[PDB]
C-alpha cells in the first residue's frame, strides 16, 4: 500500500510511519537490569558466587562477617552494570553523529537533519550527498537524462549503477511537483534488486516504477549536479535495515573455559568437604549443615574473586587496545570478549573497502614490441603531444583508449568530472587525460577531445554504439572523423573473447599470461579502417537485421561479425589494477602463516574477485583455482566430489548463488570439503549469506570466526560473527557503528590479533591460574588443619584474616600479571608462528587445572604440616601456629607471582614490594587478637625460611626443567 503524497504535514509522523534514526541502541531503561542480570547470571561460574553470597539468609550458615559476602557481590554487580551502561551510552553518543546528518529540503524551512526527515519530504541531494533513505528520483540535474549512484557501501559492487528519472516528472517543475503529485510503493521487502509501485499526476495519469527509478539506503550519489526525490521507506523499512539481523550478546571462549573448570572446582571442594565431615564423624551429627557450611567457607574466595579480577582486567585490555598509537583510533565497542582475540582460526574478509580502495589506474600498457608503465608516462606523453616508427602504434593506441568508452564528462566549475558506468572506463579516460589527450565533451552524435600542448580540440561523430553487455564482454563504436574524412571502428573487451577476432597476435597469449599473473584487469583494443559507402552497406544490413517482432535478433550479431569485427588490428592491451589497502599483500601472508584460514566473502563480480585475490597473494604463485559458478539445484554435488578427488591444495572460487545452494542442502558435505582447502572466495554474496557462512563455520568446526568489513554489506556478518571487526571507511561508518572493534584500515588487524589478542588471552589465563591457586591453597590449609586436629576448619584464619586474604594483602601482585608482555611489540612480525601455539587448550584444560590442584595441595600441605612440626596443636601455641601459617601463605603468593612473571616492568616491582610492606603494616601492627606470637626470635624466621624453601623448590625446579627442555 503506502500511498505517499508530498505535503505530509497532516500526518507528519503521528505514528503513521517510522522515524529515520536507525539507532544501534540496546536495553531500553525500562528493561535494562531485567535483561542484563538474567543474561550474566545464568553461567555457573557467576551463579556460584551469587548462591554463595545469598547464603546467610538462614542463620545456620553464617560462616563469618556479612561484609565478606555482600560487599564483593555488590562490587561485581555494580562494576558489570557500570561497564555495560557506559558502553551503551558511548555507542549512542557515537551513533548520534551520523543520525542527524543535514539534508537540504524543498517542502519548507531551511535544511533539516535526518531523524527529522521522514516519509515524503523532498530532498535536493547534492553531488556526494549520502542518501538518507530509500528514494524515488523524480527529477535529475536537468541533463534530460539519468544520474549515477555508486553502491560502494550497500552491496559492495565496485561499479556505479544507472538510475533514470521518471519519464513524466522531468517537466512538472517544483510548483506542480510539491502541490499534488502523489506516489505509491510496495511494502518493504528484502533483496537489493526489486521495486514496485507507481507515480501519479492529475487525473488517471500513471507510470510504472522500477528498481532503476529508486535510490536506496547508504548508496552515495555520484558525479551529478542535483536531483529531487521524495523518500518512500524509512525507519527500519530501508533495504539496508531490513537485510540485517538483530544484534546478539556474545561471550568469550575464556569465559566458557573458566566456567567449565569452575564446575570441576566446585565439585572438588564439595568432595573435600564431604571427606572432612565424614572423617570427623561427630561434628554435631547434622552432617548436611556442616558440609554446607564447609562448602560455603571454601567457596567464599575463588569465584567471587575470579569475577572481580576478570572484569577489572578486561578494563585494562580495552584501555590498552583503545590507547595504543601503533593501532590509533581503534576504539573498542564491546568491552566483553577482548581476550577472544588470540583464539581466532577463521577470518572471513570483505573485498570492497577492507581490501581494495575501489581506486583504479592504468598500471601498465602493452602494445607489442614494448610496454609502458604508469611511471614512464613521459614517453607516451611526448608521443601523443605530437599527434596533431612506434608513433603510429602508441598515438593510435591512446587515441582509441580516449574514444572507445561510455564516459560522459560535465563541468560544475573550471574542473571537469566523469560520470561513467564502470571504473574501468573511468580509469581509461583518466589515463588519457593524464597523458594529455583529455576527454572534454560528450553527447549522442558527438564525441570530442581536448589536446594538450597544441591546444587543438578534436571532434568525432559516433555513428553507432554497441554497449558493454554480459556474455558479450565487447564494446565498440564506429567513429567518423571530420578533421580527416576517415571512418573507424574501435573495439574494447576481454582478451579471452577478443583473441579470436584479433590479427595473428603471436605474442598476445604470452603477454597476457605474464600479465594476469599480477592480477591486472586485462583489456585488449583494436581498430579497423572503413570508408563512407561500406558503412552504408553495413547499415542497410544491420537495419534489416534489426527487424522487430521477429525472433532472429542474432542476425545483428551475424552482420557485425561479417562486416566490422573480423580482422581488427592489434593496437595492444591495458592492465587496470585495484589499489589495495596499505600492506595488505604481506598482512595476508602473515595471518595465513599464523594458521588462520583466511577466506574472502564479497558482493562483487567473479572476474574482479579473482583478479583481486591473485593480486593480494591470497592465491599462491600456482594453484588449480577451481571455479564453481552459477550452479543451481542439488545436482552440483559432482563439483564437490571432483574437489575431493582433486585432493586439496586447490583454492575454491564460488559464486554467491552456488554458495547459497550448497550451504542450504549440502551443509555438512560442503563444509567437510572447504575446511581442508587453503582459501575460499565468494562472489555476489548477498548480506545474509555471509552471516550464514559465519554461523555455519562456528557451528560445524567449533573454532572461532573473525569477520572484518565495512558498510552495511557486512553488518549482518559482524553481528553474527565472533570478535567481529569493522572498518570506518570513507563516506560511511555504519559498519563500524555496529562492529565489536574498529580500525581505520586492514593493516591494523595484523597487530590487533597477533599481539593484543594473544596477550589478552595469555594474561587472562595466567590470572585465572593464580586466582584459583590462591583460593585452593587456603582451602587446603584449612582442610588439613581440620584433618590433623579434628577442630572445625573455620577455626583457622578466623576473623579479619579471611577478608585480608580475599583482598587487600594479596590482590595487587595477582592483578599485576595483566601488565606483562610475552614478547616485545616489534618481534610479533618476525615470528608469526608463536600465535599457533594456542591452537589447542594448552592453558585452561582439565589436564592443567588438575596440575594446579596438585601443586596447591602440596603447597598447603607442606605449609600447614611444617607449621605444626615447628609448633604444637595445643591451644597454648595457637596464636603462634596461625602466624607461622598465614604469613607463610601470604609470602607464598607474593613469591609465586614473581616466579611466574615473564618480564619485570616498573609497576610490578613496585606493587609486589608495596604489598609485602603493606602486610608488614598489617595485623602484626593492629591484629593482636589473632596471628601473634613473639614472632621475632630466630627460630621463627628460620622455620619460615624452611617452609618457603620447601614450598617453592618444586615449582622453581619444574620451571627450570621445562624451560631447559
Ligand atoms: C551511567 C551508569 C552509572 C555507573 C557509573 C559508575 C559507578 C561507580 C564507578 C565505579 C565503581 C568502582 C570500580 C572502580 C574502577 C573503575 C573502572 C572503570 O569503570 O573503568 C574506567 C577506567 C577507564 O579509563 P578512564 O579512567 O576512563 O580514562 C582513560 C580513558 O579510558 C582512555 O580512553 C584514554 O586513552 P585512550 O585509551 O582513549 O587512548 C586515557 O587517557 C584516559 O582518559 O578504568 C581504568 O582506568 C582501568 C585501569 C587502567 C590501567 C592502568 C595500568 C595499565 C596501563 C599501562 C601499563 C604500562 C606500564 C606503566 C609503567 C609505570 C612507570 C611509572
Ligand atoms: F566490500 Be564490502 F561490501 F564492504
PDB file of C-alpha atoms and ligand atoms in Angstrom, residues 151-157 350-356 601-604 690 708-714 735, ligand 2:
ATOM      1  CA  UNK A 151      26.591   1.201  -4.346  1.00  0.00           C
ATOM      2  CA  UNK A 152      30.022   1.030  -2.697  1.00  0.00           C
ATOM      3  CA  UNK A 153      28.554   0.709   0.812  1.00  0.00           C
ATOM      4  CA  UNK A 154      25.217  -1.053   0.194  1.00  0.00           C
ATOM      5  CA  UNK A 155      26.020  -4.264  -1.706  1.00  0.00           C
ATOM      6  CA  UNK A 156      29.740  -3.774  -2.387  1.00  0.00           C
ATOM      7  CA  UNK A 157      29.584  -3.762  -6.187  1.00  0.00           C
ATOM      8  CA  UNK A 350      35.285  -8.447   2.640  1.00  0.00           C
ATOM      9  CA  UNK A 351      36.849  -7.186  -0.578  1.00  0.00           C
ATOM     10  CA  UNK A 352      35.443  -3.698  -1.166  1.00  0.00           C
ATOM     11  CA  UNK A 353      36.773  -1.229   1.383  1.00  0.00           C
ATOM     12  CA  UNK A 354      38.706  -3.675   3.549  1.00  0.00           C
ATOM     13  CA  UNK A 355      40.973  -4.883   0.733  1.00  0.00           C
ATOM     14  CA  UNK A 356      40.502  -2.603  -2.291  1.00  0.00           C
ATOM     15  CA  UNK A 601      33.319 -13.182   1.027  1.00  0.00           C
ATOM     16  CA  UNK A 602      32.248 -10.378  -1.304  1.00  0.00           C
ATOM     17  CA  UNK A 603      29.204  -8.960  -3.048  1.00  0.00           C
ATOM     18  CA  UNK A 604      31.237  -8.218  -6.178  1.00  0.00           C
ATOM     19  CA  UNK A 690      27.985 -14.085   4.611  1.00  0.00           C
ATOM     20  CA  UNK A 708      36.063  -7.831   9.073  1.00  0.00           C
ATOM     21  CA  UNK A 709      34.075  -5.491   6.854  1.00  0.00           C
ATOM     22  CA  UNK A 710      32.761  -2.013   6.187  1.00  0.00           C
ATOM     23  CA  UNK A 711      29.438  -0.657   5.010  1.00  0.00           C
ATOM     24  CA  UNK A 712      26.005  -2.176   5.568  1.00  0.00           C
ATOM     25  CA  UNK A 713      27.044  -5.097   3.366  1.00  0.00           C
ATOM     26  CA  UNK A 714      28.757  -6.697   6.369  1.00  0.00           C
ATOM     27  CA  UNK A 735      29.562  -0.921   9.820  1.00  0.00           C
TER      28      UNK A 735
HETATM   29  F1  LIG B   2      33.377  -4.624   0.330  1.00  0.00           F
HETATM   30 BE1  LIG B   2      32.273  -4.685   1.391  1.00  0.00          BE
HETATM   31  F2  LIG B   2      30.843  -4.564   0.775  1.00  0.00           F
HETATM   32  F3  LIG B   2      32.440  -3.526   2.400  1.00  0.00           F
END
